[PDB]
From Swiss-Prot:
The active site is at 35, 52. This is Lysozyme C. Its main location: secreted. Pfam families: Lys. Belongs to the glycosyl hydrolase 22 family. It is found in: Secreted. One of its GO terms (molecular function) is identical protein binding. It comes from Gallus gallus (Chicken).
Length: 129
């Protein structure tokens, strides 16, 4: 599923990401835009053999099991394929664990390089929330 900008904002709000650990909703929408272009089915392989999955490009090296990342962890206790669903619940719940682990949203390279320090409120401007 390719979300629209305001559609995704509303879904993330319903699932409790607005101001979660202090990060306003626009931060999460911006991260999703540049990680996946709002596409729940996005995948990308990393140099070390791990793979990033879904609208927030969560990494199999630490967070989910895909059966092909030897020596990795599965800290969200989910198969990585569950992060590709049109229902974003699994991605959101895993992202909550990630952002709570001490490094905040700096875990998302695209957030750090393209969202951090910008006017992220523009990502939810005009949306009915
Ligand atoms: Cl957009
Ligand atoms: Cl915001
Ligand atoms: Cl594995
Ligand atoms: Cl949902
Ligand atoms: Cl933080
Ligand atoms: Na893994």
């Amino acid at each position: 599923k390719v979300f629209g900008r305001c559609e995704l904002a509303a879904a993330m709000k319903r699932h409790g990401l607005d101001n979660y650990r202090g990060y306003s909703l626009g931060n999460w929408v911006c991260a999703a835009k540049f990680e996946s272009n709002f596409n729940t089915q996005a995948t990308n392989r990393n140099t070390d053999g791990s793979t990033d999955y879904g609208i927030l490009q969560i990494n199999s090296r630490w967070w989910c099991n895909d059966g092909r990342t030897p020596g990795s962890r599965n800290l969200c206790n989910i198969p990585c394929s569950a992060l590709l669903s049109s229902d974003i619940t699994a991605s959101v719940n895993c992202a909550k664990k990630i952002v709570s682990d001490g490094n905040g949203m700096n875990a998302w390279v695209a957030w750090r390089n393209r969202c951090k320090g910008t006017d992220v409120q523009a990502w939810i401007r005009g949306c009915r929330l």
